[PDB]
Symmetry: D2
Amino acid sequence: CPLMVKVLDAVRGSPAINVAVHVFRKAADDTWEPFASGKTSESGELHGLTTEEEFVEGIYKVEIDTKSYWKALGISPFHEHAEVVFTANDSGPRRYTIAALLSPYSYSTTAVVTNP
Amino acid sequence: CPLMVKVLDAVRGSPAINVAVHVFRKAADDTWEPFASGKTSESGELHGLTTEEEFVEGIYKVEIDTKSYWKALGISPFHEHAEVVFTANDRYTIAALLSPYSYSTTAVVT
Amino acid sequence: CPLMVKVLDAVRGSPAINVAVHVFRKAADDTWEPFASGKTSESGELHGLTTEEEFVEGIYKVEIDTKSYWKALGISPFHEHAEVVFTANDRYTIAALLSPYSYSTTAVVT
Amino acid sequence: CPLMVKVLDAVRGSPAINVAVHVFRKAADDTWEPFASGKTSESGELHGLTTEEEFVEGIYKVEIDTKSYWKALGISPFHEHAEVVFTANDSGPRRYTIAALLSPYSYSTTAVVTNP
Ligand SMILES: Cc1nnc(-c2ccnc3ccccc23)[nH]1
Ligand SMILES: Cc1nnc(-c2ccnc3ccccc23)[nH]1
Ligand SMILES: [Ca+2]
Ligand SMILES: [Ca+2]
């Protein structure tokens, strides 16, 4: 799994479950093209987005649907989403974990990049 | 003063100075219209972006050029930028704390 | 103004108002001597804690009473408090962003 | 494992490896007593601190030695440590993950609490 996403909820102290995640890749023409999508599991983790073959060099955007997450819990959140945009695999293939921690008016994100 | 951006550096323990910030408003065709821009000051703050009459309800995007910031300090960064997207509903401070492989953002709405 | 504390609320998107803050300095016997205290203001800030002559080099602890803060809002919190411990070496802002099960802290030293 | 600690490095985008962690429990007399200690692994994780039998109700303090971590990397950090202090198991046994994200002048911490 060269790309994994993990989401936590800072209000409840829990994994953020059933969070939709959409991944895009910048095309030659500078537009965002769909790349992969999925939803977090009961552990707040999303595996299986992509493969070593499909996850080529490029500029990727990981868009985490924070707004729907909070709205489902009955809460009115501030942000439309949380996005992470980065260049991947420039110096050869790497594994990337994008982690996010969510509150209604705030989020943080970190990347863990490892060399297979 | 309806909209202010404040940027902090978690590596140096300082304001993030001379950070480029561009603000956009979402247009009816779902594209992003330029709205405001500037560079953070010596205090890491960017004031004077808009006025009450100009800042209508809508979806706004604050694009912070974190990559140029880190490169100007000689530090290797992960992100292309940090973009913060929110709805304004009828004073907003967008605050960001930057590290090379992470960022945090909060809204202070008073 | 050598020492300021600023507290923000990530749930409400606001300053964290009326938060109790106690500052201590580490004594030669490794116990903690009271140094300063106060409650954050309407802006989430606590100024006027010390003076330049009083704030000598040493190890300082800033204890923020996050549990009382959350309970006064009717919200169930994880932590007993948030304590931030650092060395002052010859202006410091200790900033904290609070959530019920998490907190973040940074130092702005100028 | 009722108590786990995970540490990440926000500068390098990596697990924070070889971080010392000391856990204390408040005694009857209101002092901190040693409870357990260990160091993070190559994954930035510390397992095996305690057991279901030993991890009784109480007020616990998890002290993460951030200062030594940065100093070993040749960096002068701001904080002496990062601590997390919480009441555990008050409404019955729970599993607790304390996660921390480190930068030289900043840290964040979150708790993930689950019901076995
Ligand atoms: C998953 C996961 N493992 N550690 C974290 C984490 C902890 C503290 N602060 C954060 C801020 C941003 C993203 C993750 C984190 N998340
Ligand atoms: C002052 C001041 N205005 N914003 C912070 C802030 C913003 C985002 N994330 C955080 C994480 C930790 C501490 C402060 C912050 N500090
Ligand atoms: Ca290349
Ligand atoms: Ca009990």
